[PDB]
Amino acid sequence: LELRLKSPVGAEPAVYPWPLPVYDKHHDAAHEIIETIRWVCEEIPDLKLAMENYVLIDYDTKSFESMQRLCDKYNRAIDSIHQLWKGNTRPSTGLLRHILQQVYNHSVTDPEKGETSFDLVAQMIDEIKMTDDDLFVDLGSGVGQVVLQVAAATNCKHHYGVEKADIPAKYAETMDREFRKWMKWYGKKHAEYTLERGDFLSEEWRERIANTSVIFVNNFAFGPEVDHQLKERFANMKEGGRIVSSKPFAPLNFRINSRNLSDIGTIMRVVELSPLKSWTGKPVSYYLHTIDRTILENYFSSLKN
Ligand SMILES: Cc1ncccc1-c1c(Cl)sc2ccc(NC(=O)NCC(=O)NCCCN(C)[C@@H]3CCCN(c4ncnc5c4CC=N5)C3)cc12
């Protein structure tokens, strides 16, 4: 008693047991199956032609037979297309959102222990414009969704996620497995990444932060001691190093003077960025900090002149 979806690239099939799992009040495996089929049909125009029209319209998610017939029709169309062909690119943004949701639903089995975030991360990725020279770190990466989104979208040398908390770091291990598996199932390419359990305030992480060109950090809920210690870690970063955060680490209007020479504002430019400046989501801002020690050098040059 199960349902199978054949991979469009010949990987192992996706196997779902019956009764199908319900993930939450807004997500279930039946709709995940239907949406997976629809995404594969977008990926492969021949597949849409091979598949009969009525199949994705006339379906009963509460009927094993109807869900089985839907899977059988898609599976037969995959076989016909595989036969036609007998004669790895980066996923689209829409497909990537589906993959990340699918990876999360299969990994976070008990959510008690995405949408607006996804589109915001996509905006941040578009603004920062990382290259193969960059090293990316999401400081306090949770279950790893931001790292997975960035790794699937950019060509950074490596993407890292560091998470201290036990429950998220444990779920991240499954998120990592499920992501690699689903990305292979669709035949989609992603850059290298690592989800690690650790403390970003450790001695090991002091040098790693110093050597990171792009840091993303959701610092909104951090205490003043974590924030204070992070500013100290950022003070070792290279010129041009960037920090994208949910709360600024220095004032937007920082003005260097004789009384504030110890502030992080002496060595970084800070700008408030917003998708509102065609966005229709939450009126949210993010903060881009760029390491620039010329702020401090110019102040000293002006003291001597
Ligand atoms: C996109 C977005 N959507 C909604 C709101 C905001 C945003 C947002 C911006 Cl707006 S900018 C931006 C940049 C990055 C990110 N990334 C993530 O969201 N990444 C996932 C995510 O879940 N991030 C939060 C994980 C929090 N953790 C459980 C721990 C809490 C305690 C601390 N901690 C911890 N870890 C390791 N060592 C440690 C510590 C403490 C001391 N030493 C981590 C997000 C955003």
DSSP state for residue 25 in the 8-state scheme: T
Q: Does the Cβ of 201 fall within 6 Å of ligand 1?
A: yes
143 is in an annotated binding site: yes
Per-residue tokens: 36: 């997976």
**Are 234 and 257 found together in one domain?**
yes
216 is in an annotated binding site: no
Q: Which residue's CA is minimally distant from atom 19 of ligand 1?
A: 141
Specify the number of domains making up the chain: 2
Q: Does the Cβ of 108 fall within 6 Å of ligand 1?
A: no
Nearest residue to 222 via CA among 120, 114, 291, 140: 140
49 is in an annotated binding site: no
Nearest residue to 40 via CA among 71, 15, 18, 61: 71
DSSP assignment string, 118-163 = HHHHHHHHHHH---TT-EEEEES-TTSHHHHHHHHH---SEEEEEE
C-alpha distances out from residue 233 to 129, 169, 228, 236, Å: 23, 22, 9, 6
DSSP state for residue 239 in the 8-state scheme: T
Phi first, then psi: what are they for 108, rounded to 5°?
-85, 85
Question: Hey, CA dihedral for 278, 281, 285, 291, is it positive or negative?
Answer: negative
Which ligand 1 atom is the nearest neighbour of the CA of 121?
Answer: 1
Helix (H, G, I), strand (E, B) or coil at 23: strand
**Are 125 and 155 found together in one domain?**
yes
Q: Does the Cβ of 273 fall within 6 Å of ligand 1?
A: no
Q: Taking the chain, what is the end-to-end CA distance rounded to the nearest angstrom?
A: 82
- Cα 162 to its chain centre, rounded Å, is 14
Nearest residue to 29 via CA among 107, 114, 106, 109: 106
CA distance 211 to 232: 14
**Are 106 and 196 found together in one domain?**
no
Per-residue tokens: 169: 């770091």
CA distance 51 to 74: 7
Q: Does the Cβ of 175 fall within 6 Å of ligand 1?
A: no
**Are 82 and 145 found together in one domain?**
no
CA distance 162 to 144: 9
Nearest residue to 37 via CA among 10, 8, 66, 16: 8
DSSP state for residue 249 in the 8-state scheme: S
Q: What is the CATH number of the domain that holds 196?
A: 3.40.50.150
With vertex at residue 212, the alpha carbon angle to CA 167 and CA 263, rounded to the nearest 5 degrees, is 95
CA distance 217 to 146: 10
Distance 175 CA to ligand 1 centre (A): 16
CA distance 4 to 7: 10
Which ligand 1 atom is the nearest neighbour of the CA of 245?
Answer: 11
C-alpha distances out from residue 196 to 62, 81, 96, 165, 237, Å: 40, 40, 22, 11, 21
Beta bridge partner(s), residue 242: 214, 290
Q: Does the Cβ of 256 fall within 6 Å of ligand 1?
A: no
Q: Which residue's CA is minimally distant from atom 16 of ligand 1?
A: 218
141 is in an annotated binding site: yes
46 is in an annotated binding site: no
**Are 167 and 246 found together in one domain?**
yes
Residue owning tokens 């990466």 = 141
- Domain end: 58, 93, 113, which one? 113
**Are 191 and 211 found together in one domain?**
yes
**Are 134 and 89 found together in one domain?**
no
Which DSSP helix (H) or strand (E) runs through 226? helix 224-234
**Are 136 and 64 found together in one domain?**
no
107 is in an annotated binding site: no
**Are 94 and 160 found together in one domain?**
no
Provide the pairing of β-strand 242-245 with 286-291.
Answer: antiparallel
**Are 63 and 177 found together in one domain?**
no
Q: Residue 205: give the domain boundaries.
A: 118-305
Q: Helix crossing, 145-153 with 166-186: angle to 10°?
A: 30
- Cα 1 to its chain centre, rounded Å, is 34
**Are 103 and 37 found together in one domain?**
yes
Q: Does the Cβ of 226 fall within 6 Å of ligand 1?
A: yes
Which DSSP helix (H) or strand (E) runs through 242? strand 242-245
